[PDB]
């Protein structure tokens, strides 16, 4: 499924995962992706910080949902 | 230049372009500034639906214009 990141630069970055995927999986995408270090991505869902052992269905993430990247 | 985007919900945003800028520039100066998602946007003119590779200038889009957003149905 297609998400989007946000980032606080208006950049936004499109990813392909599955919501069985956990939030490290996630961040070291984005790293692949955009080069950002894992331990420097706080990743924003509905007001809720996401934490790396969590899957995306744990938070009811669907697809084309948007998660927001703060560094 | 200034142009005009009118939404479905009687929200008109205002954004300065240049005529040489893309669709796909446009949509994410849009996205920027109201945060609607690029693949929701659809962007209306004289009644043509604009597409993302080609610019203003191509549509013959002059200053203080008004485009039309529509917004692809929720969710995919
Ligand atoms: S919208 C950014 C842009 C304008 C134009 C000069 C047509 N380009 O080639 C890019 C895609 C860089
Ligand atoms: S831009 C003219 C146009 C718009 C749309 C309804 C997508 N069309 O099918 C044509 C190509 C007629």
């Given at each position: 499924?297609?998400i989007?990141?946000k980032?606080?630069?208006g950049?936004?970055?499109?990813?392909?995962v599955?919501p069985?995927?956990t939030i490290?999986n996630?961040?070291?995408?984005?790293?692949?992706?955009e080069?950002i270090?894992?331990?420097?991505?706080?990743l924003?869902?509905?007001?809720?910080?996401?934490?790396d052992?969590?899957?995306?269905?744990?938070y009811?993430?669907?697809?084309?949902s948007?998660?927001?990247?703060?560094?």
């Amino acid at each position: 499924m297609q998400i989007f990141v946000k980032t606080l630069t208006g950049k936004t970055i499109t990813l392909e995962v599955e919501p069985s995927d956990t939030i490290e999986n996630v961040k070291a995408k984005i790293q692949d992706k955009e080069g950002i270090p894992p331990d420097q991505q706080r990743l924003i869902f509905a007001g809720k910080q996401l934490e790396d052992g969590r899957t995306l269905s744990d938070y009811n993430i669907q697809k084309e949902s948007t998660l927001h990247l703060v560094l």
